[PDB]
Design a protein around this ligand. Structure first.
Ligand SMILES: C[C@H]1O[C@H](O)[C@H](O)[C@@H](O)[C@H]1O
Length: 305
């Protein structure tokens, strides 16, 4: 039957695993086969497309490991008469500007970043921390736009709620995973012995979790640390632990919607030249904590907790 690709940069994250599961559902519903491929670097990305072409695939959905590979992906796909849809990470040209012509499906990055900071501040208030001895550790991935709108949004929200701007410290992470964030947080932590309580800002669950793991290694106990991640599905193993940790909760978006809808739209495009909207922004978000994560995932059909 019709074969369609679903290429993701980080197959190890439950976030992409979930996109793959719902693309499969779209396939069963619409009558297509989904070829699931991992594209963790640029070389694998370009090679994977050649592979799709040998398999007979008519197009693919892709979350690129690098926005700057956009030109190349488009050139190759065009050579093979394949339609492409981007999911989560937008393609950019050489200069860093958006390839607005490639359909994109993504979450509302600024808005979810802002919700992260609002919830950080509220939980801080609930605990009664003295602002004078508190600080925000912002672990950033500024070369990736979607990551950058989320952390800027969170810092903006904290500043709007009145968190002192001079107590907001930013540190770049070399990889968007636990090991990179861990390293990044550890180097910021020893620069600030004066701080007794930390707010950890990061664009996704893995980033926040690396930050939390580093604070633990420097002697902070869970009461003095608040980290709220983004993805939701990626935090289930943390929230499932017996004891509470500095990872307070996660903002759960809709990876299920991202997997089904991008796949369904690709299909309609390939099968009926039905042109997708250029930009699909999904605004859904719920805060999951130790207390409600299993109810909330089951309510969304992302069952098991
Ligand atoms: C919305 C998604 O955006 C980026 O691609 C991140 O790398 C993912 O973990 C997920 O948070």
């Amino acid at each position: 039957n019709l074969k369609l690709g679903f290429l993701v940069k980080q197959p190890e994250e439950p976030w992409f695993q979930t996109e793959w599961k719902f693309a499969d559902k779209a396939g069963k519903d619409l009558g297509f086969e989904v070829i699931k491929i991992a594209v963790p670097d640029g070389e694998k990305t370009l090679n994977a497309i050649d592979s799709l072409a040998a398999s007979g695939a008519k197009g693919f959905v892709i979350c690129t490991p690098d926005p700057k590979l956009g030109s190349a992906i488009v050139a190759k796909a065009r050579g093979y008469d394949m339609k492409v849809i981007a999911v989560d990470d937008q393609f950019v040209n050489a200069k860093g500007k958006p390839m607005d012509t490639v359909p994109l499906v993504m979450l509302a990055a600024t808005k979810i970043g802002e919700r992260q900071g609002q919830e950080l501040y509220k939980e801080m208030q609930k605990r009664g921390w003295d602002v004078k001895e508190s600080a925000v550790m912002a672990i950033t991935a500024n070369e990736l736009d979607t990551a950058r709108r989320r952390t800027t949004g969170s810092m903006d929200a904290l500043k709007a709620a009145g968190f002192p701007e001079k107590q907001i410290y930013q540190v770049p992470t070399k990889s968007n995973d636990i090991p990179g964030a861990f390293d990044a947080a550890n180097s910021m932590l020893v620069q600030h012995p004066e701080v007794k309580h930390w707010l950890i800002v990061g664009m996704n669950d893995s980033t926040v979790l690396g930050g939390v793991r580093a604070t633990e290694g420097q002697g902070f106990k869970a009461a003095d640390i608040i980290g709220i991640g983004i993805n939701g599905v990626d935090a289930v193993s943390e929230l499932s632990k017996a004891q509470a940790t500095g990872f307070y909760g996660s903002l759960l978006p809709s990876p299920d919607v991202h997997g089904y809808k991008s796949s369904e739209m690709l299909y309609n495009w390939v099968a009926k030249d039905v042109e997708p909207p250029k930009f699909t922004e999904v605004t859904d978000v719920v805060l999951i904590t130790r207390d409600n994560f299993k109810e909330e995932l089951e309510k969304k059909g992302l069952g098991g907790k």
